[PDB]
Amino acid sequence: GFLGAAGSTMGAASMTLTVQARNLLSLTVWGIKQLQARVLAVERYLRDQQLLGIWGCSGKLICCTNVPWNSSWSNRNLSEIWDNMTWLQWDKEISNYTQIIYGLLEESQNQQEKNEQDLLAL
Amino acid sequence: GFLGAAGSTMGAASMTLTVQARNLLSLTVWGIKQLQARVLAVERYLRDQQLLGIWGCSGKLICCTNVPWNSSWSNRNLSEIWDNMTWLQWDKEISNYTQIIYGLLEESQNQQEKNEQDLLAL
Amino acid sequence: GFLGAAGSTMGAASMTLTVQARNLLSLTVWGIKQLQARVLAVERYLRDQQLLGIWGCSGKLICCTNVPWNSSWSNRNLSEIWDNMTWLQWDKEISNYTQIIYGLLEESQNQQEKNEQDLLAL
Amino acid sequence: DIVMTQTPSSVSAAVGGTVTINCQASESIYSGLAWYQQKPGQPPKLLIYRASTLTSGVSSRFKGSGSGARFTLTINDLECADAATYYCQSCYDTTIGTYGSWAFGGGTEVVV
Amino acid sequence: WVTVYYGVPVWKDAETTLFCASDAHNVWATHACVPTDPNPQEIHLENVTEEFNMWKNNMVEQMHTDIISLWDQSLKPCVKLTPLCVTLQCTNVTNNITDDMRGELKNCSFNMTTELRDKKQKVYSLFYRLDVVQINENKEYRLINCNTSAITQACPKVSFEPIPIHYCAPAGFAILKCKDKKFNGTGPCPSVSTVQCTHGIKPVVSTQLLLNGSLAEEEVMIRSENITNNAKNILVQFNTPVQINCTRPNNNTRKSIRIGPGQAFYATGDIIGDIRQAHCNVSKATWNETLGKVVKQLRKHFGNNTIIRFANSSGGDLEVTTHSFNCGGEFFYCNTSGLFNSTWISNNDSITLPCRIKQIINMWQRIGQAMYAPPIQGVIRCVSNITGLILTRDGSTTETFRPGGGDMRDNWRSELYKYKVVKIEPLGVAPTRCKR
Amino acid sequence: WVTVYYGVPVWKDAETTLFCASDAHNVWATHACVPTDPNPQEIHLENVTEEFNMWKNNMVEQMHTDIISLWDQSLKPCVKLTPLCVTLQCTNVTNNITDDMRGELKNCSFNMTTELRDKKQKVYSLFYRLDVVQINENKEYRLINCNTSAITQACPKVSFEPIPIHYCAPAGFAILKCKDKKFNGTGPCPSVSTVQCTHGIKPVVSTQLLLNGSLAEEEVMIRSENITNNAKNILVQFNTPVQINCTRPNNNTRKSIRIGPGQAFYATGDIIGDIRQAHCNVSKATWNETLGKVVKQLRKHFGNNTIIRFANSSGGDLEVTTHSFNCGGEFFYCNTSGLFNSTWISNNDSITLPCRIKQIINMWQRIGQAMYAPPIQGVIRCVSNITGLILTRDGSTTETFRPGGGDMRDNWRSELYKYKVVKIEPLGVAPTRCKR
Ligand SMILES: *[C@@H]1O[C@H](CO)[C@@H](O[C@@H]2O[C@H](CO)[C@@H](O[C@@H]3O[C@H](CO)[C@@H](O)[C@H](O[C@H]4O[C@H](CO)[C@@H](O)[C@H](O)[C@@H]4O)[C@@H]3O)[C@H](O)[C@H]2NC(C)=O)[C@H](O)[C@H]1NC(C)=O
Ligand SMILES: *[C@@H]1O[C@H](CO)[C@@H](O[C@@H]2O[C@H](CO)[C@@H](O[C@@H]3O[C@H](CO)[C@@H](O)[C@H](O[C@H]4O[C@H](CO)[C@@H](O)[C@H](O)[C@@H]4O)[C@@H]3O)[C@H](O)[C@H]2NC(C)=O)[C@H](O)[C@H]1NC(C)=O
Ligand SMILES: *[C@@H]1O[C@H](CO)[C@@H](O[C@@H]2O[C@H](CO)[C@@H](O)[C@H](O)[C@H]2NC(C)=O)[C@H](O)[C@H]1NC(C)=O
Ligand SMILES: *[C@@H]1O[C@H](CO)[C@@H](O[C@@H]2O[C@H](CO)[C@@H](O)[C@H](O)[C@H]2NC(C)=O)[C@H](O)[C@H]1NC(C)=O
Ligand SMILES: *[C@@H]1O[C@H](CO)[C@@H](O[C@@H]2O[C@H](CO)[C@@H](O)[C@H](O)[C@H]2NC(C)=O)[C@H](O)[C@H]1NC(C)=O
Ligand SMILES: *[C@@H]1O[C@H](CO)[C@@H](O[C@@H]2O[C@H](CO)[C@@H](O)[C@H](O)[C@H]2NC(C)=O)[C@H](O)[C@H]1NC(C)=O
Ligand SMILES: *[C@@H]1O[C@H](CO)[C@@H](O[C@@H]2O[C@H](CO)[C@@H](O)[C@H](O)[C@H]2NC(C)=O)[C@H](O)[C@H]1NC(C)=O
Ligand SMILES: *[C@@H]1O[C@H](CO)[C@@H](O[C@@H]2O[C@H](CO)[C@@H](O)[C@H](O)[C@H]2NC(C)=O)[C@H](O)[C@H]1NC(C)=O
Ligand SMILES: *[C@@H]1O[C@H](CO)[C@@H](O[C@@H]2O[C@H](CO)[C@@H](O)[C@H](O)[C@H]2NC(C)=O)[C@H](O)[C@H]1NC(C)=O
Ligand SMILES: *[C@@H]1O[C@H](CO)[C@@H](O)[C@H](O)[C@H]1NC(C)=O
Ligand SMILES: *[C@@H]1O[C@H](CO)[C@@H](O)[C@H](O)[C@H]1NC(C)=O
Ligand SMILES: *[C@@H]1O[C@H](CO)[C@@H](O)[C@H](O)[C@H]1NC(C)=O
Ligand SMILES: *[C@@H]1O[C@H](CO)[C@@H](O)[C@H](O)[C@H]1NC(C)=O
Ligand SMILES: *[C@@H]1O[C@H](CO)[C@@H](O)[C@H](O)[C@H]1NC(C)=O
Ligand SMILES: *[C@@H]1O[C@H](CO)[C@@H](O)[C@H](O)[C@H]1NC(C)=O
Ligand SMILES: *[C@@H]1O[C@H](CO)[C@@H](O)[C@H](O)[C@H]1NC(C)=O
Ligand SMILES: *[C@@H]1O[C@H](CO)[C@@H](O)[C@H](O)[C@H]1NC(C)=O
Ligand SMILES: *[C@@H]1O[C@H](CO)[C@@H](O)[C@H](O)[C@H]1NC(C)=O
Ligand SMILES: *[C@@H]1O[C@H](CO)[C@@H](O)[C@H](O)[C@H]1NC(C)=O
Ligand SMILES: *[C@@H]1O[C@H](CO)[C@@H](O)[C@H](O)[C@H]1NC(C)=O
Ligand SMILES: *[C@@H]1O[C@H](CO)[C@@H](O)[C@H](O)[C@H]1NC(C)=O
Ligand SMILES: *[C@@H]1O[C@H](CO)[C@@H](O)[C@H](O)[C@H]1NC(C)=O
Ligand SMILES: *[C@@H]1O[C@H](CO)[C@@H](O)[C@H](O)[C@H]1NC(C)=O
Ligand SMILES: *[C@@H]1O[C@H](CO)[C@@H](O)[C@H](O)[C@H]1NC(C)=O
Ligand SMILES: *[C@@H]1O[C@H](CO)[C@@H](O)[C@H](O)[C@H]1NC(C)=O
Ligand SMILES: *[C@@H]1O[C@H](CO)[C@@H](O)[C@H](O)[C@H]1NC(C)=O
Ligand SMILES: *[C@@H]1O[C@H](CO)[C@@H](O)[C@H](O)[C@H]1NC(C)=O
Ligand SMILES: *[C@@H]1O[C@H](CO)[C@@H](O)[C@H](O)[C@H]1NC(C)=O
Ligand SMILES: *[C@@H]1O[C@H](CO)[C@@H](O)[C@H](O)[C@H]1NC(C)=O
Ligand SMILES: *[C@@H]1O[C@H](CO)[C@@H](O)[C@H](O)[C@H]1NC(C)=O
Ligand SMILES: *[C@@H]1O[C@H](CO)[C@@H](O)[C@H](O)[C@H]1NC(C)=O
Ligand SMILES: *[C@@H]1O[C@H](CO)[C@@H](O)[C@H](O)[C@H]1NC(C)=O
Ligand SMILES: *[C@@H]1O[C@H](CO)[C@@H](O)[C@H](O)[C@H]1NC(C)=O
């Protein structure tokens, strides 16, 4: 079920991640409307994929990064977050740090790629 | 030649795979028709790329998976399939197992990514 | 700044590569025009991504290849190219070898993937 | 389609003091729980509704609480008040959206 | 520490463009819809609650806009009747006509254009009183819209049957639905499930009564934006249908008049048999029980000993004071006072509603685009299910309610109240113990 | 050795489709534009020079096309006036009319159609001399366009106010802008910055003088494709505005005539008070100083002791010999000879320009689509900033310049001269010391 994991805890829900991923691409009245909708759906898909590319998480549903958790974002324990909370609740808890985390992920990836080139040039 | 390998055997044809890949993206009568065609061509491209992403074969023309061949799908020998048969013939031979194989590939990739996270968390 | 690195040398400019990457996706008069523009912007994005895929550089801003520099393309020193020249100047210096390099990159990647399969089959 | 699990199936006490009965829903029922007391020979009597409200046919001796999918019943002092089988009932079926679909767990025999 | 997860099952309220689907010459071009799923899925969301608000639901707005635009596109190729704005010389129809129907039909004659520019023809036809006005205060008359709008004849081959459509979300979106059988339109909804497409909804147009919608499964439901505010409507949904039988008991003929090359006008010809008044029958016992149920529920908002009275509509145009509907292709305007005539105190037969008929219709309460409904030969009979009412408060121990009309939007929000559109936001992050 | 880099900051000249944005019933449908950025960014490019050419700038062509298409779409729903192509019986207006205005207005009467096809009505209205021609060489007249084009009445609710729009590049493109305060339209531009959107540009239409554009920041600028070629225009941009005050000092009435169902024509009714000539005032001292500045700069291309003379326009249609503009909704054609009457030798008051008014307008110099401008009641007064001139060379020690008209394109290339569109090409390669 497409949103079937909505009531699951975070540590339970993140095992069925492909279910949602597979459903993101799926001149008269009801004519021009479909053409416009199709184009916008494509743009949304690509923006999310570009971010995974930039952060170094392309091709993965789950990726580890090398960016530290800064605590002030959320000072909850891992056993509390993963076992006693759902993704809807979590999304609300840290919604205002979204842009902070994304900026940190982008810079980290740029530093990593530059360092890999220095090693391949050695 | 775009379909030049059509008469080649499978083990001969799968060396020129980029030839076809490079040709997949390439309000009046003959006006609105082109806009509609362009959008649909993009959607087709993306659906195939999403599947390679899901199965863990993104960025590759040839990828090995860890899913076993179940024999009943086709009980032919490797020396028969790769040397004495073309891709058109093969596609007909196993056309009805397409959905089985894809489901197996998807589950395998989800298990692999979860296990990699457990190791990176160690 | 989106083109802020335009006046920087090549070795200075290629540290802010995500700045430009993030800005590539971003029936009446001013109606149909936007729909047509959006579709074409998507096609341009995808053609560049497909080439990085084909050459084995998907997911990277900087990638090393295994294709040699043939000298005749440009016989300048690395200390001259990276420190005393901008990307606009460089693009002019080797503009006519673009198609040569791309053809070489494509063949190299096909050979590499075939060899990896032979090893995984061992 | 709501399944209620009730435990322990058998609870006992010395005369004087408290015992508890627990009940776990297979899905949150948003506190739509009722508790009943059935003595041998009669239909069940309603003691508590909407998780913690008493029917006034019962004294403060019977108390309870809970939320979501998990609830408990506490009998504060057992004076051989009963030898009743207590039952956990769901009064709301979230899979339908109604109060017309009930479910009962097995009961608990209280001995004292 | 930071782990990025893609495919996270979360969403946000959103407004997007929905498309229609249809389970397969119609005025709403339902053939232009995407074929439906013969077996659509629905997913129950365990432990998920959501907040709904039917008064701010933009799905209503899209349905409203699609209906009007489709309606207008369907008339684009139809013949214009501007050559009819002539002085009509006209008298009454008096042949075997029932009293109280007398004066409703008139026999008018005029000089109409024809196939050749050099010729004129004398023709005559019958008109209903409501479609003409007297100018020479036989007497001279004109069609009622000749000083305000263009008149377009509806194409005779186009059907007005309210064939249902389904709304479907685009990729990246989902439609959430309430299952709570007592949901009153706003606030938390304890049982939610997802669909890709809505149930089929019939684009039925009516005023005071809702003629062919959904019934409440259990209890009679009363929904309003406020209840307290006398400026707001109350939508009452019945939990049982009330059967209504309508008829136009006049056997009519139809004739065409050529008005120019490739063009013809359809005129009422003459009447076969006696002339009788159009009417609708509502079962009396059912109506009485149905109101009793409505009153018991209305009292919950007004007081245990509050008296509830029903009264008929206020004065004004037929379009807002009568019960109107399109059935069999005719446009009826029925007098509903026989249904709203009672006082409810704390602690076989039928009701006959006389009706009027019009051929010149301002369909969406707009000015400048008039449609002419060509006559239909033979006799028309219709049977439908009344499913609900639109009531207003006439505003200290007695409350009075009157039926009334309303926006077209109120006839659609009554079906779409259970649906919400959300967008899916698959990226999110969380702390974990791993590092690259 | 070969390293592939993505996100390389390079670009190439390119031609694409631009879209409009607007900072928010208008004839240009500016509400259809994308809302603008309240705080747009501009990036300075250090050490970057670029080559510009305002005479080959395709942004001008898109602006030209959008304006014409929007203009035409705005008239699509408006009433046609084809029933007015009748013989008008007509005489002069002689009531309290100022000499030299006498003969400009005529009192015409005719048999007009009405709401009913069977009736005709006698109506009369006032027309300007320039909109009619005599046929019976009272005298019979006809409207000037009845033998060549259809006449459409502009909708009275639609505004012609030149509300500015911004052009914005699509993703993958950028707009480069010159900052050089002395840039003359072509060649290297030492200081370049990037924007996503242009400054707001007002779609002002005029001929000999440019009435509401941008001023030069420092020096008066003279720009031309050639200067030397007498077939080319010279665009002169002022560094200070010249104030011009225009008026139509006649208090007019307006009346509507019903011409058919849903349709009415707006006619000039009568004149309240005396009849006077329309005119524009230009401050005299400012004009004199402004020309002196222009002459000092023109001499740089013609010689240190070359004499510069200004003369008025050549003969031809008002549309090309006069200064025309749309202000307050009226179309003025003003006589500019009082502004171009001097010889410049090496080493409070006002100028009054009389004006004519027309109601039938061939707006884009096209033939077949005529617009009728309905009259405006009351009195009209306009104030504007003259920002520049369009001059041509009348082509041995004296040069003579004359004002003239030109393509509509020349009124837009004067604002867009600083902008260039380029496309971004993010892939490139270079030798490095690394190998996979
Ligand atoms: C509420 O729902 C009911 C039930 O669905 C609905 O009643 C139906 O109305 C339609 C139209 O009035 C009826 O269909 C007609 O039945 C007669 C029977 O002989 C046929 O002859 C008709 O066919 C002719 O007219 C068509 C018009 O487009 C032509 O296309 C065709 O070629 C023929 O000329 C037509 O089939 C239908 O029978 C009833 N249903 C029942 C059970 O009586 C009712 O109208 C709905 N109420 C409202 C207000 O919409
Ligand atoms: C050069 O720029 C100047 C300054 O922006 C510009 O002058 C402005 O012209 C407009 C239109 O002529 C004036 O606006 C009018 O002001 C009067 C004052 O009482 C109002 O009554 C008018 O409103 C009526 O007309 C409207 C027409 O669409 C109707 O929509 C409205 O409902 C009313 O009927 C209207 O506001 C404006 O005041 C002047 N500005 C100044 C400072 O005087 C000038 O026209 C530009 N030049 C050119 C050639 O474009
Ligand atoms: C809704 O919530 C209930 C509990 O609040 C979840 O029930 C759990 O189901 C798993 C299934 O194996 C059990 O192992 C757990 O022990 C149950 N919880 C408890 C407290 O016993 C239920 O799964 C939730 N629904 C979803 C979709 O996650
Ligand atoms: C079409 O079929 C023929 C044989 O049936 C293929 O011929 C082979 O060509 C290769 C080229 O080096 C030879 O080495 C083989 O020995 C040939 N086959 C035989 C049986 O000798 C031919 O290549 C096929 N065409 C394509 C496109 O594959
Ligand atoms: C434009 O060019 C100047 C020099 O030609 C660049 O100046 C350099 O700035 C860096 C900043 O730390 C200094 O370390 C260098 O020493 C400067 N150059 C010299 C010769 O001293 C300037 O940065 C360039 N602009 C851009 C965008 O790169
Ligand atoms: C078009 O004609 C109708 C009929 O004469 C006008 O409607 C009448 O308007 C008067 C105004 O006081 C009312 O008293 C009448 O009751 C109206 N008649 C009807 C049948 O409603 C209508 O106003 C005219 N339209 C225009 C634009 O003048
Ligand atoms: C709707 O029908 C009712 C009755 O069938 C009409 O009511 C009559 O109206 C006249 C108006 O003065 C009264 O004198 C009668 O006493 C009323 N009769 C009853 C039984 O109340 C009503 O007028 C009709 N409405 C319309 C618009 O025709
Ligand atoms: C439409 O009528 C006008 C008015 O008679 C014609 O314009 C005249 O053409 C003659 C030709 O030599 C000129 O001398 C007149 O000066 C013109 N009059 C005006 C007012 O300019 C016009 O040519 C006719 N159009 C067509 C297509 O015949
Ligand atoms: C524009 O105005 C000027 C003067 O205000 C008009 O010039 C007059 O033209 C007649 C034509 O033969 C001459 O005899 C006069 O001597 C001119 N006067 C001056 C002061 O030069 C000019 O004709 C007007 N233009 C138009 C088209 O009416
Ligand atoms: C026609 O109707 C009018 C309505 O008042 C009536 O006065 C007149 O007598 C009627 N004529 C006939 C012939 O019935
Ligand atoms: C209308 O008048 C004509 C005149 O002869 C008559 O034949 C026709 O039957 C009349 N129609 C009605 C319905 O009275
Ligand atoms: C048709 O025109 C003639 C012309 O005199 C007129 O007498 C006659 O009454 C008109 N007929 C009708 C029915 O209007
Ligand atoms: C609908 O039910 C909710 C439940 O709390 C209530 O708050 C709301 O006021 C009700 N709606 C109306 C119009 O009373
Ligand atoms: C309408 O609802 C609002 C909701 O807050 C309420 O404040 C207002 O008083 C209501 N109207 C009336 C007349 O009570
Ligand atoms: C309504 O009831 C009356 C009662 O006599 C009956 O004659 C009439 O035919 C009925 N109308 C319908 C539509 O059945
Ligand atoms: C409508 O017609 C059906 C036909 O069987 C009849 O049974 C029913 O009672 C009628 N309804 C009314 C309100 O007369
Ligand atoms: C319903 O029937 C009862 C029977 O006595 C009657 O008293 C009551 O007034 C009726 N109600 C209506 C609305 O007709
Ligand atoms: C409602 O009934 C009263 C009864 O006298 C009547 O006067 C009034 O006109 C009726 N309303 C309508 C719209 O018929
Ligand atoms: C309303 O009820 C009264 C009660 O006597 C009755 O006389 C009147 O006719 C009824 N009105 C209608 C419209 O039936
Ligand atoms: C109307 O009259 C005609 C005359 O022959 C008849 O054939 C037709 O069936 C009648 N229609 C009805 C509904 O009775
Ligand atoms: C009226 O409701 C009944 C309920 O079962 C249904 O069977 C019947 O088809 C409905 N009629 C209409 C016209 O929807
Ligand atoms: C109308 O204008 C013409 C133009 O020459 C003139 O000859 C004629 O006398 C004028 N008539 C009147 C009444 O002024
Ligand atoms: C036009 O002629 C009519 C005829 O009576 C007159 O009333 C009107 O004032 C005249 N208009 C002008 C502006 O002379
Ligand atoms: C209107 O037509 C009549 C027909 O004789 C003619 O005499 C009259 O002059 C015309 N009126 C006008 C103003 O053209
Ligand atoms: C504009 O300035 C450049 C600077 O070299 C010059 O070459 C060019 O000719 C000038 N333009 C004109 C029209 O003279
Ligand atoms: C126009 O400019 C070109 C530029 O090369 C020049 O050759 C030509 O001579 C110029 N025209 C004149 C008349 O000088
Ligand atoms: C132009 O100047 C004259 C000088 O007397 C003055 O009368 C007139 O009103 C002025 N016009 C304007 C538009 O101010
Ligand atoms: C235009 O009007 C303003 C009003 O204050 C006046 O100051 C200015 O001098 C006028 N301009 C001209 C050219 O008369
Ligand atoms: C400007 O004013 C001076 C004052 O003497 C005068 O000589 C000169 O000719 C004037 N120039 C113009 C263009 O009026
Ligand atoms: C320019 O001025 C001269 C002065 O005699 C005049 O003859 C000529 O017609 C004027 N040009 C225009 C277009 O008025
Ligand atoms: C041009 O200057 C001469 C100088 O005497 C003057 O007589 C003439 O009237 C002026 N022309 C205009 C249009 O003012
Ligand atoms: C035009 O005259 C009318 C007559 O009352 C007056 O009200 C109006 O203000 C006048 N307009 C002007 C601009 O003076
Ligand atoms: C004319 O230029 C001045 C310069 O500051 C400006 O303030 C004024 O608004 C401008 N007028 C118009 C109509 O643009």
* Chain E residues 60-79 with CB within 8 Å of chain F: none
- The b/e string for F288-305 (b: 16+ C-beta within 10 A; e otherwise) is eebbeebbeebbeeeeee
Consecutive H or E run containing F266: strand F263-272
- Using DSSP, state whether F57 is helix, strand or coil: coil
Other C-beta atoms lying within 10 Å of the C-beta of residue D93: 20
Distance (angstroms) between ligand 12 centre and the Cα of E113 equals 12
Return the SS3 of E91: strand
Alpha-carbon span B67 to E313, nearest angstrom: 73
Which protein residue has the closest C-alpha to ligand 11 atom 9? Answer: E270
Q: Which residue is closest to A43 within chain F, CA to CA? A: F171
d(C-alpha B79, C-alpha B69), whole Å: 15
User: What count of other Cβ atoms lies within 10 Å of the Cβ of residue B103?
Assistant: 11
- The residue length of chain D stands at 112
List the one residue out of F63, F406, F56 whose CA is nearest residue F235. F406
Rounded distance between C-alpha atoms, residue A3 and residue A16, angstroms: 10
Beta partners for residue D109, in sequence order:
D10, D85
Burial of F71 (0-12, 13-18, 19+ CB in 10 A): buried
Angle (CA) F420-F424-F426 rounded to 5° is: 160
Across the interface, of C27, C106, C116, the residue whose CB is closest to B18 is C106
Distance CA F425, CA E372 (A): 60
Question: Cβ–Cβ contacts within 10 Å for residue A89, how many?
Answer: 13
For chain A, the chains sharing at least 3 beta-carbon pairs closer than 8 angstroms are B, C, E, F
Q: Which of E268, E255, E257 has its CA nearest to residue E93?
A: E268
- Phi, psi at F426, each rounded to 5°: -70, -15
Query: Are C114 and B21 in contact (CB < 8 Å)?
Result: no
Query: Within 13 Å of residue E11, how many CA atoms lie on the same side as its CB?
Result: 26
Provide the 10 A C-beta neighbour count for residue E342: 14
Angle at alpha carbon of residue E349, lines to E343 and E350, rounded to 5°: 70
**Which residues fall within 8 angstroms of residue E252, CB to CB, at 6 or more apart?**
E268, E269, E270, E271, E272, E375, E376, E377, E378
- Please tell me the distance from the alpha carbon of residue E96 to that of residue F147, in angstroms, as a whole number: 58
* CB E115 within 8 Å of CB E260: yes
Chain C residues closer than 8 Å to B62 by CB: 113-114, 116-117
Neighbours of E291 (CB within 10 A): 20
Q: Could you tell me which residues come within 8 angstroms of residue D8 by beta carbon, excluding any fewer than 6 positions away?
A: D21, D22, D108
Q: Computed over its alpha carbons, how large is the radius of gyration of chain B?
A: 19
Beta-bridge partner residues of E143: E132
C88: three-class secondary structure by DSSP: helix
DSSP secondary structure string, F207-236? SSEE-S-PPPSSS-EEEES-SS-TTS-EEE
Ligand 13 center–CA E186 separation, angstroms: 6
CA separation (Å) from A14 to A6, A11, A85, D72? 10, 6, 12, 31
Environment class of C13 (CB within 10 Å of its CB; exposed 0-12, middle 13-18, buried 19+): buried
> What number of helices (H) and strands (E) belong to chain C?
6, 1
- How far apart, in whole angstroms, are the C-alpha atoms of residue F416 and residue F414? 6
**Dist CA D8 CA F129 (whole Å):** 106
**CB count, 10 Å around CB of F426?**
21
Of the candidates D16, D23, D34, the one whose C-alpha atom is nearest the C-alpha of residue D79 is D16
What residue of D is the nearest CA neighbor of E193? Answer: D95
Looking at beta carbons, which residues of chain F come within 8 Å of C17?
5-8
Place of tokens 């025999």: D109
Task: With an 8 Å CB cutoff and a minimum of 3 pairs, decide whether chains A and C touch.
Answer: yes
Angle at alpha carbon of residue F264, lines to F261 and F265, rounded to 5°: 150
Total count of residues recorded for chain F: 436
* Among the partner residues A34, A68, A91, nearest to E1 by beta-carbon distance: A68
Q: Please classify residue E339 by burial: count the beta carbons closer than 10 Å to its beta carbon, then call 0-12 exposed, 13-18 middle and 19+ buried.
A: buried
2-61 in chain E: CB under 8 A from chain D: 44, 46-47, 49
Nearest 5°: phi and psi at F260?
180, 175
Q: Which residues of A touch B42 (CB under 8 A)?
A: 42
Cβ within 8 Å, pair B113-A62: yes
User: Which chain C residue has the Cα nearest residue A57?
Assistant: C59
Q: Contact F190/F180 with Cβ under 8 angstroms?
A: yes
Residue C54, H or E segment: helix C32-55
Give F389 to chain C, closest Cα distance, Å: 31
CA distance E395 to E381: 38
* Cα–Cα distance list, E313 to E184, E246, E333, E400 (Å): 26, 21, 13, 11
Mention every residue, 6+ apart, whose C-beta is less than 8 A from residue F109: F88, F89, F90, F122, F123, F124
E354 Cβ inside 6 Å of ligand 18: no
- Which amino acid would we find at residue E220? V
Interface test with B, best of A26, A57, A62 (most B CBs within 10 A): A62
Please list every residue in chain A followed by a chain break, i.e. its C lies more than 2.5 Å from the next written N: 26
Distance between Cα F328 and ligand 2 center (Å): 6
Method: cryo-EM
Report the nearest-CA residue for atom 8 of ligand 19: E341
Contact E85 F115 (CB under 8 A): yes
Does the CB atom of residue C7 touch ligand 5 within 6 A?
A: yes
Which residue segment(s) compose the domain that B32 sits in? Answer: 3-120
CA distance B38 to B63: 29
The DSSP line for E137-199 is --EEEEETTTTT-EEEEPPTT-B-----BEEEPPTTEEEEEE--TT--SEEEES-EEEESBPP
Report which residue type is found at E23.
Answer: D
Could you give the residue ranges of the DSSP H alpha helices within B32-94? 32-55, 78-84, 87-93
- Ligand closest to Cα of E310 equals 17
DSSP for E267-322, please give it: EEEEEES-B---EEEEEHHHHHHHHHHHHHHHGGGT-TT-EEEE--PPSS-HHHHS
Using CB atoms and an 8 Å cut-off, which of residues 35-64 of chain C contact chain B? 35-36, 39, 42-43, 46-47, 50, 53-54, 56, 58-59
Sequence-distant (≥ 6) Cβ neighbours of residue F304 within 8 angstroms? F346
Respond yes or no on whether the N-terminal peptide bond of residue E156 is cis (omega within 30° of 0).
no
- Token representation of residue F95: 């009531």
The Cα diameter of chain E in Å comes to: 97
Gap positions in chain D, given as the residue before each gap (C–N > 2.5 A)?
Answer: none
Count Cα neighbours of E370 within 13 Å in the Cβ-side half-sphere. 20
Q: What is the DSSP letter of E26?
A: B
Instruction: Evaluate: CB of E281 within 6 angstroms of ligand 12.
Output: no
Distance CA A104, CA A66 (A): 10
What is the layout of strands, in order, in the sheet containing F150-153?
Answer: F150-153, F369-372, F360-361
For residues C45 and F7, is the Cβ–Cβ distance under 8 A?
A: no
Nearest bound ligand to CA E353? Answer: 7
Element (H, E) at A20: helix A17-21
How far is it, in rounded angstroms, from Cα A1 to Cα E152?
50
Report how far residue E395's alpha carbon sits from residue E376's, in angstroms, rounded to the nearest whole number.
43
F286 Cβ below 6 A of ligand 27: no
The enclosing H or E element of C47 equals: helix C32-55
Per the CB < 8 A criterion, the answer to whether F188 and F49 are in contact is yes
What torsion do the CA atoms of E62, E65, E71, E74 make, to the nearest 10 degrees? Answer: -80
* Alpha-carbon gap, residue F410 to F185, rounded angstroms: 13
CB C20 within 8 A of CB F424: yes
Angle between helices C32-55 and C98-120 (to 10 degrees): 60
Residue E49: both structure tokens together:
């609650």
Residues, chain E, total? Answer: 436
Cβ contacts of E209 within 8 Å, gap of 6 or more: E323, E336, E386, E388, E389, E390, E403
All partners of chain C with 3 or more CB pairs under 8 angstroms = A, B, F
- State the Cα–Cα distance between residues D60 and D76, nearest whole angstrom: 8
**Cα–Cα distance, E338 to D57 (Å, whole number):** 50
Query: How distant is the Cα of A67 from the closest Cα of chain F, in angstroms?
Result: 23
- The one-character DSSP state at F55 is T
CA torsion F315-F316-F319-F323 (nearest 10°) is 0
Q: Do B121 and E436 touch (CB under 8 A)?
A: no
Q: How many domains does the structure of chain A reveal?
A: 1
The string of DSSP letters for A50-97 reads: HHHHHHT-TT-SEEE-SPPP-STT----HHHHHHH-BHHHHHHHTGGG
